[PDB]
């Protein structure tokens, strides 16, 4: 079963390919509609794998150096194995001398094709958490942020380092525990500082005067954080507070760049509004002029966007090169400037949380998801990851899309045609979780080809780990080229891998045009039809869902930015470029459930025909969980119904990282708009029925 | 008295045994009794010359020396709703006006007739005419802004060397003991800044568990980090500043900051005080080397170096003028152990009406003299009265023109002096000249008005008026000469000559001043003949040439000579004389010829001796009054009765080496010497420490440096000085 | 917004209390003293004056004038509320001694209450007659 195959492969190797059978001929490889690509999750959890506490045992060839895997041919007599990538024959190390057939190493069993090693390079560095706190906000918002911080401070490992940077009009680097005075370093939030400058102006496990262990400081910090007060400078009438977020961040980056470079560190920046002063300015201090919108940026009425973005873009590279994570937690009624600051959590593995106020159940709970621990009381986050991908000599890498930066490492596996962050065999992911998913795009130049994903990262325990995943997919039999390929198509994976491409070109500019030419080309190669007869068009069960996915994608909030704020668009795209397949599907096409007296909860269609008056709905957009009460039910048996969706909601309303906004509305309420909008150029669309009619009118015509 | 001529080569004992008194101007009995106090206001020539030709012939300088803000025993305060001032020259109504029509008075400075307003009513019995020294209440138009509050911003250096000196402890302990005694009401504001490589502000809020230290490290671009709690209200934050003063000395014990950013730190302090003004106290301990205002090191001279002074940069001069404009005064406390270019640093106080204080090689253990000296000098400094945003005007009758000012201030338009602060221990001097012949009048007058804001927020004006008669004979000019005032105005002129030319020309000008005046007197009449008013002129000018300001063949260093010059330019005349020509007494045999009138205390009055070792005696002990200190020298063969009954010691060998003061033993000998010492230090507001360390071998016999009549390997004796002058008088 | 507060005795214009912070003041302080001179027993008890970018506001109670200046953009509603808080405190503390004093600024120590009340109105996160001043002068 091709479905059981896709499931089990994503369960074991945490990967979802668009094609599980690959073209064996250059003619079909060039004429590939949806490219061969993978939805790869390097740190996916699974039924408790055995952590390997020895060296991974590489191949003996300067160019290859691939890891021993279940695809290698072993000779238990000669103590020799043959590399499956370069055919080089290797001697078993002395540690493997007593190798036996009836008792073979873990890295050779097909069950451990994806396996993790524990390596020791030296002393385990402690974790680093740098709080960068905005003080230009109301007291209720500031006090709540203080309560959220003291909560996160209590979950940290004692060995971990902490530092506090508060800011408003000025930027204060706090030196903690100096007894009797409690001092800080004040800087001007109007001019940017480099790292060498910041090192000059400021000056057994290591620790600075500003980054001290929690165990020795958690008491002076929890008293400083409790005495924090709003930015002391007045805010005159009709003005915004002078908020120097661009400089506050560059000082946070610069501080860690000269003290703990190339080590796991988390820069957590908390914002209560836009940056109104210094580099990276998002808007002036005049409340008369509103923050830019998508309309203003299209009509050239936003003079701070380009200049502001470049500043934060230079900091994102500075932090990603050094290897540190930048999180952004924005809570404010107005916009905040996520569009200009998106690159900091996007190039790194940083989080981006959004909300209206730090004094909400929405933010408070979301923030503690960051510090969720596993079966050993340790954080579900890694740091300083290096992903290297080994391919067969016939496969080349076009590039990756997702939270990563190129290490610009050349080799025979690098493809000329690059896509996204391409032109390399190695990428750096400063932050990752068991959820972080990348999108690797490949190019083809008894069968079977293989790809090896090697990810070396720093575990929250301090150990250094290497995760090796080796997969193999069959080469297409030349007597059944397109027939085998057609049967191995992952319509869900391809849809997200194609959405990944469209959103990437949109956020770095038509895009809908390319998305429609590829939908038609896919219909014209793998669909059955007679020429000039639209009625004749059918799609295999392998392809039938692709058009519906493409229907919701081109209308989704990821490619139609208007009706959303620029911060909302970047936030939506931020999470879609990191999530796995199941969550990425929910984003593009929300899931719907029906609740009525006539039957248990059931999944229905995203069509206005499902909005019944005598029925309660439960729509799952990844960003919001909604419960709709029809005009009838909008008034013990009537209690089982009104709380059936509220019960099913709470379950999923906790596992998801960015806690989706909860909504309770009914027919006539102003909040039912979110349901009526997700319901229902080339391939100009009204609704799905018309979309398919037009799609078939163009598929059966000239190609 | 005496209209008699003196032959200095035969007398050689012309210094009287009793203290010198300021000459009485040759005025009518009813005018002199109303004349101003000579301590507050005095002139070098009590008989003003009539023509400039006459003044030039005399070869003597004409000028005034004033101590306008001195503490008074009784001060009349006039609260008149109108200040009677001449409608032309704005001179205040003074005792020496001429009432004619009884409703019209003639101004004694511009001769204009003015109308007495109805309110002033016998108008000659008004207190404004019965007192030369008087303090008014300034109206609404005599202040540019509401009375500024008293602001006290202390600025501490906390480099590695500063922490070694240990000065911070006593300074903080002095501020603790004198916190309720700072001048001011509930409006009093206080502040603190420490600095080294970076400027450190200190916030004080009652909502916080402790003060907060805010460090600005941008040296090339300083700013104020917080707008509210940096200059706090002393009355409300009393408990907070106390904890900070108890904590400040303990914060830097282990510092490695070897450099100090003096320049940028004052720019910060200036910005902090600019909105209001006040008194900026600066404590520096070493050469500034980091940031703007950095100064290069200098090699100290030796005895062998000739006379070959000026600031190395104008940074601290420009900053002082910026403080002046904002009614900020800077007082510089230099506790340096090595050269620090005080010639440059001092400009921060000279042009901002501050005052510099010097404690060479301060150390909390090694130098106990500088500790108790700083202790007592901080006592006066913190408790003495103060005035803020002050100006001063010196007016003199038509014909006389002021042309040179001396003192710590900034001269705006001529005759206008800007005093950001005014302290009751500053002296000022002026040099004037006859611009128009005084054939008309036979009396002249001089007035000084001090418009200042009191520590209680009351804009006050203190006015002094001096009247002097005009003469037309050369001999009448000499008869009214004030030798001490001449020495003072000469000392000030010689300081400028050092900056403008060199130390050589300054010394030559001082010697030529005695030659040219006595040569002019000789032409106007064998030995060295001088008038009675100039018998002590070559002695004092000699003592000037041996003072640390102008001495040559001494091992004196750069910051020593500069500070001596600062004291010449900022001290009243009385203390310039006490330092230059100390008063010597023998105190091992005091008796009852004293002023035993002060009820139960005798207070012996021993005769004054001249500054020559030939007057000493190894058999007794001698106390020397140098104004600032009372060095008690004990002889080797001293009497046994003086050892046990006065020193509490059984032999000369067991006299404690650093003896910081005398013991108050229960003996009539100790009762007499403690009665005479306590009477000397009561004549001044700056308590002088008395150290008897001056044994015959304490390596601290600078007591002999003040024997200005004797010779040394690099200076003439008093008899050799007289011989040098006589050869030049009759060349 | 910004600040300028002066309290004067209307009969003669004798200054009572004030409060000024810069880091010009010389021009508008004079105008404030020109107005105190013109104010008499026929002047409006509550009035507002326009001085271009600046705007004066004052009240008169017990022969005492409470004048404030700020940028015209400052709410006139908040200006008179700031003056009301000053009068009720000043009349309660010194209202009976005003007609007796004769020194300029005999109530300087009111500097503290003026400034602590001042900040409660010049910060948004804490919450009659009109004529050109040039006419009355
Ligand atoms: Zn190999
Ligand atoms: Zn006159």
């Amino acid at each position: 079963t091709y479905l059981e195959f896709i499931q089990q492969n994503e369960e074991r190797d945490g990967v979802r390919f668009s094609w599980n059978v690959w073209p064996s001929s250059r003619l079909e490889a060039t004429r590939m509609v949806v490219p061969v690509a993978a939805l790869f999750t390097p740190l996916k959890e699974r039924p408790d794998l055995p952590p390997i506490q020895y060296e991974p045992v590489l191949c003996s060839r300067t160019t290859c150096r691939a890891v021993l895997n279940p695809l290698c041919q072993v000779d238990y007599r000669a103590k020799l194995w043959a590399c499956n990538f370069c055919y080089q024959r290797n001697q078993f190390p002395p540690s493997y001398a007593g190798i036996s057939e009836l008792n073979q190493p873990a890295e050779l069993l097909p069950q451990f094709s994806s396996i993790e090693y524990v390596v020791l390079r030296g002393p385990q560095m402690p974790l680093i958490f740098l709080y960068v706190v905005d003080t230009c906000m109301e007291d209720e918002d500031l006090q709540a942020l203080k309560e959220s911080m003291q909560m996160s401070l209590s979950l940290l490992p004692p060995t971990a380092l902490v530092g506090l940077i508060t800011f408003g009009r000025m930027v204060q680097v706090h030196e903690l525990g100096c007894e009797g005075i409690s001092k800080s370093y004040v800087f001007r939030g109007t001019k940017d500082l480099s790292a060498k400058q910041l090192q000059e102006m400021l000056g057994p496990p290591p620790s600075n005067r500003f980054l001290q262990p929690v165990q020795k400081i958690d008491m002076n910090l929890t008293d400083l954080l409790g005495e924090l007060q709003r930015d002391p400078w007045p805010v005159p009438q009709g003005k915004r507070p002078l908020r120097s977020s661009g400089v506050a961040l560059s000082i946070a980056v610069g501080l860690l760049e000269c003290t703990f470079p190339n080590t796991g560190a988390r820069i957590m920046m908390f914002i209560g509004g836009p940056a109104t002063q210094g580099p990276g300015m998002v808007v002036g201090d005049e409340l008369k002029t509103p923050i830019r919108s998508w309309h203003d940026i299209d009509k050239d009425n936003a003079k701070y966007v380009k200049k502001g973005t470049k500043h934060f873009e230079a900091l994102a590279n500075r932090a990603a090169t050094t290897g540190h994570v930048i999180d952004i937690y924005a809570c404010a009624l107005d916009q905040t400037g996520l569009l200009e600051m998106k690159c900091c959590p996007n190039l790194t593995g940083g989080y981006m949380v959004m909300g209206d106020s730090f004094n909400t159940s929405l933010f408070k709970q979301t923030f503690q998801r960051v510090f969720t621990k596993d079966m050993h009381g340790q954080f579900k986050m890694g740091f300083g990851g290096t992903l290297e991908i080994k391919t067969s000599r016939e496969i080349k890498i076009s590039g990756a899309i997702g939270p990563c930066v190129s290490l610009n490492s050349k080799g025979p596996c690098v493809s000329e045609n690059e896509i996204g962050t391409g032109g390399t065999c190695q990428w750096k992911i400063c932050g990752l979780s068991p959820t972080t998913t990348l999108a690797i795009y490949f190019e083809v130049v008894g069968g079977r080809g293989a790809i090896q994903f090697v990810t070396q990262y720093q575990h929250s325990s301090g150990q250094r780990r290497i995760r090796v995943t080796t997969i193999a997919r069959n080469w297409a039999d030349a007597q059944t080229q397109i027939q085998n390929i057609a049967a191995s198509f992952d319509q869900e994976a391809a849809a997200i891998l194609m959405a990944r491409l469209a959103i990437y070109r949109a956020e770095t500019e038509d895009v809908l045009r390319w998305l429609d030419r590829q939908l038609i080309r896919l219909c014209q190669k793998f669909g059955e039809y007679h020429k000039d007869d639209p009625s004749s068009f059918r799609f295999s069960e392998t392809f039938s869902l692709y058009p519906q996915f493409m229907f919701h994608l081109r209308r989704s909030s990821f490619l139609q930015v208007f009706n959303n704020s620029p911060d909302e668009s970047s936030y939506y795209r931020h999470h879609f470029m990191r999530q796995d397949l199941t969550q990425s599907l929910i984003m593009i096409q929300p899931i719907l459930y029906a609740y009525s007296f006539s039957g248990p909860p059931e999944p229905v269609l995203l069509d206005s025909s499902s909005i019944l008056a005598d029925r309660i709905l439960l729509m799952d957009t990844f960003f919001q969980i909604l419960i709709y009460h029809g005009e009838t039910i909008a008034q013990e048996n009537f209690r089982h119904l009104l709380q059936a969706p509220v019960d099913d909601a709470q379950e999923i309303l906790h596992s998801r990282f960015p806690m989706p906004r909860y909504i309770d509305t009914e027919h006539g309420g102003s909040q039912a708009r979110f349901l009526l909008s997700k319901v229902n150029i080339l391939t100009d669309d009204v609704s799905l029925q018309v979309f398919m009619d037009h799609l078939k009118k163009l598929a059966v015509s000239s190609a | 008295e005496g209209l008699r001529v003196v032959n200095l080569l035969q007398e050689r004992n012309m210094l009287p045994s009793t203290p010198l008194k300021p000459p009485v101007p040759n005025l009518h009995e009813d005018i002199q009794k109303l004349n101003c106090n000579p301590e507050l206001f005095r002139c070098t020539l009590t008989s003003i010359p009539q023509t400039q030709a006459l003044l030039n012939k005399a070869k003597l300088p004409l000028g005034l020396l004033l101590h306008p803000f001195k503490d008074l025993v009784q001060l009349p305060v006039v609260t008149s709703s109108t200040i009677v001032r001449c409608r032309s020259c704005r001179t205040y109504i003074n005792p020496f006006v001429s009432f004619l029509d009884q409703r019209r008075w003639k101004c004694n400075l511009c001769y204009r007739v003015n109308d007495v307003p109805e309110e002033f009513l016998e108008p000659h019995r008004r207190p404004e005419v019965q007192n030369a020294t008087i303090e008014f209440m300034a109206p609404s138009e005599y202040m540019l802004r509401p009375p500024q509050p008293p602001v006290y911003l202390f600025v501490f250096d906390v480099s590695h060397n500063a922490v070694e000196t240990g000065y911070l402890n006593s300074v903080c302990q002095s501020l603790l003991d004198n916190l309720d005694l700072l001048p001011g009401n509930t409006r009093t504001k206080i502040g603190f800044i420490t600095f080294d490589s970076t400027i450190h502000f200190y916030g004080l809020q009652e909502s916080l568990s402790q003060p907060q230290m805010l460090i600005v490290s941008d040296i090339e671009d300083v700013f104020i980090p917080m707008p509210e709690n940096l200059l706090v209200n002393l009355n409300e934050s009393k408990e907070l500043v106390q904890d900070l003063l108890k904590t400040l000395p303990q914060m830097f014990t282990k510092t490695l900051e070897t450099q100090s950013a003096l320049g940028p730190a004052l720019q910060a302090a200036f910005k902090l005080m600019s909105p209001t003004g006040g008194r900026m106290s600066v404590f520096q301990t070493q050469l500034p080397t980091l940031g703007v205002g950095a100064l290069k090191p200098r090699e100290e001279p030796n005895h062998r170096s000739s006379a070959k002074m000026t600031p190395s940069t104008d940074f601290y001069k420009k900053l002082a003028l910026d403080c002046s404009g904002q009614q900020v005064a800077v007082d510089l406390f230099l506790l340096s152990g090595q050269y620090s270019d005080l010639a440059s640093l001092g400009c921060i106080s000279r042009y901002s009406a501050g005052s510099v204080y010097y404690y060479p090689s301060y150390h909390h253990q090694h130098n106990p003299v500088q500790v108790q000296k700083l202790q007592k000098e901080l006592q006066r400094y913190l408790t003495r009265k103060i005035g803020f945003e002050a100006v001063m005007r010196i007016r003199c009758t038509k014909g006389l023109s002021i042309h040179t000012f001396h003192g710590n201030f900034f001269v705006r338009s001529t005759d206008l002096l800007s005093l950001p602060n005014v302290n009751p221990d500053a002296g000022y001097a002026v040099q004037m000249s006859v611009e128009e012949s005084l054939t008309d009048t036979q009396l002249v007058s001089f007035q000084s008005a001090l418009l200042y804001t009191s520590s209680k927020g009351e804009r006050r004006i203190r006015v002094h008026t001096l009247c002097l008669p005009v003469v037309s004979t050369l001999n009448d000019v000499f008869l009214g000469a004030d030798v001490q005032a001449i020495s003072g105005l000469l000392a000030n002129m010689a300081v400028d000559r050092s900056m403008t030319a060199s130390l050589s020309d300054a010394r030559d000008a001082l010697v030529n001043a005695v030659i040219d005046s006595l040569s002019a007197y000789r032409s106007s009449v064998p030995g060295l003949m001088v008038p009675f008013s100039l018998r002590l002129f070559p002695l004092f000018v000699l003592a000037l040439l041996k003072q640390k300001s102008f001495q040559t063949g001494t091992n004196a260093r750069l910051d020593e000579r500069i500070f001596a010059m600062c004291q010449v330019k900022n001290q009243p005349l009385v203390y310039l004389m006490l330092t230059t020509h100390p008063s010597l007494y023998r105190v091992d045999n005091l008796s009852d010829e004293g002023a035993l009138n002060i009820s139960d205390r005798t207070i012996p009055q021993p005769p004054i001796l001249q500054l020559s070792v030939e007057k000493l005696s190894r058999d007794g002990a001698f106390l020397m009054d140098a104004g600032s200190v009372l060095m008690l020298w004990v002889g080797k063969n001293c009497t046994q009765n003086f050892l046990s009954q006065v020193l509490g010691v059984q032999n000369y060998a067991s006299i404690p080496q650093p003896m910081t003061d005398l013991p108050e033993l229960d003996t009539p000998e100790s009762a007499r010497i403690i009665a005479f010492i306590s009477w000397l230090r009561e004549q001044r507001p700056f308590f002088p420490i008395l150290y008897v360390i001056a044994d015959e071998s304490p390596m601290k016999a600078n007591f002999l440096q003040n024997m200005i009549e004797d010779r040394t390997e690099s200076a003439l004796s008093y008899y050799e000085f007289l011989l040098h002058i006589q050869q030049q008088v009759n060349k | 917004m910004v600040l300028l507060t002066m309290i004067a005795r209307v009969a003669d214009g004798l200054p009572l209390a004030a409060s000024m912070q810069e880091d010009d003041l010389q021009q508008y302080q004079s105008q404030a003293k020109q107005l105190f001179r013109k104010l008499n027993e026929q002047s409006p008890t509550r009035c507002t004056l326009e001085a271009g970018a600046m705007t004066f506001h004052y009240i008169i109670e017990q022969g005492v004038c409470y004048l404030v200046l700020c940028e015209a953009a400052f709410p006139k509603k908040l200006a008179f509320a700031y003056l009301e808080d000053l009068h009720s405190e000043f009349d309660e503390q010194h209202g009976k001694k005003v007609p007796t004093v004769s020194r300029p600024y005999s109530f300087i120590e009111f500097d503290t209450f003026i400034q602590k009340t001042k900040k409660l109105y010049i910060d948004s996160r804490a919450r009659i007659m009109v004529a050109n001043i040039e006419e009355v002068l």
Side-chain angles (χ1 to χ4, degrees), chain B residues 86-91 105 107-112 114:
Chain B
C86 168
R87 291 184 179 180
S88 280
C89 64
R90 304 314 308 271
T91 300
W105 63 281
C107 184
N108 55 331
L109 272 72
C110 75
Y111 307 142
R112 147 137 191 189
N114 285 269

Side-chain angles (χ1 to χ4, degrees), chain A residues 59-100:
Chain A
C59 169
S60 60
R61 180 169 282 180
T62 301
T63 45
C64 176
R65 254 186 175 180
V67 187
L68 183 61
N69 52 90
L71 303 175
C72 302
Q73 304 171 326
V74 197
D75 187 1
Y76 291 69
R77 168 173 182 76
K79 316 302 178 183
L80 302 181
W81 58 282
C83 183
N84 73 279
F85 293 91
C86 71
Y87 300 88
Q88 180 67 76
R89 312 212 156 181
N90 303 270
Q91 162 206 344
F92 270 87
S95 60
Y96 281 61
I99 222 291
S100 54

Side-chain angles (χ1 to χ4, degrees), chain A residues 405-419:
Chain A
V405 171
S406 169
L407 293 182
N408 203 37
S409 61
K410 303 302 175 185
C413 313
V414 169
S415 180
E416 293 288 334
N417 170 32
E418 66 169 310
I419 289 178

Side-chain angles (χ1 to χ4, degrees), chain A residues 30-66:
Chain A
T30 292
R31 291 182 157 189
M32 195 57 54
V33 185
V34 175
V36 179
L39 217 60
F40 169 61
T41 299
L43 299 192
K44 187 161 194 168
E45 289 177 316
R46 47 169 303 178
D48 308 321
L49 273 189
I52 295 299
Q53 298 175 21
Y54 55 74
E55 208 62 42
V57 182
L58 315 174
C59 169
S60 60
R61 180 169 282 180
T62 301
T63 45
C64 176
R65 254 186 175 180

Side-chain angles (χ1 to χ4, degrees), chain B residues 456-521:
Chain B
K456 299 295 110 61
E458 306 186 22
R459 244 288 210 254
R460 300 226 186 193
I461 321 170
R462 184 171 301 197
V463 181
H464 312 278
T465 315
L466 168 71
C467 180
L468 294 178
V470 179
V471 296
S472 50
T473 304
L474 235 191
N475 177 255
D476 291 357
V477 180
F478 286 106
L479 287 176
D482 188 341
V483 62
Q484 294 186 125
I486 290 172
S487 295
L489 179 59
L490 278 172
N492 276 242
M493 293 163 58
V495 171
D496 292 8
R497 185 66 60 85
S498 300
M499 310 286 98
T500 236
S502 71
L503 186 70
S504 325
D505 299 311
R507 294 174 54 87
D508 293 355
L510 286 167
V511 173
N512 297 337
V514 184
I515 293 173
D516 302 328
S517 68
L518 299 185
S519 177
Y521 185 75

Side-chain angles (χ1 to χ4, degrees), chain A residues 595-664:
Chain A
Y595 297 75
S596 53
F597 298 86
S598 53
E602 299 167 34
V604 298
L605 273 60
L606 275 189
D607 209 322
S608 294
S609 56
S610 300
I611 309 175
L612 294 182
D614 66 320
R615 199 158 76 168
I616 300 179
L617 295 183
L618 172 50
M619 182 174 66
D620 182 3
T621 304
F622 176 81
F623 308 103
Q624 52 172 359
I625 285 178
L626 194 144
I627 292 176
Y628 180 86
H629 307 281
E631 184 183 344
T632 296
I633 317 191
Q635 304 158 359
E636 295 285 52
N637 61 321
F638 194 55
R639 281 202 165 193
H640 286 305
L641 171 63
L642 268 176
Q643 215 181 47
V646 183
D647 269 52
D648 284 308
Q650 303 284 328
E651 306 159 9
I652 184 172
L653 193 54
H654 278 290
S655 63
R656 189 170 292 159
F657 159 59
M659 194 174 74
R661 199 169 55 183
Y662 184 83
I663 287 180
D664 193 309

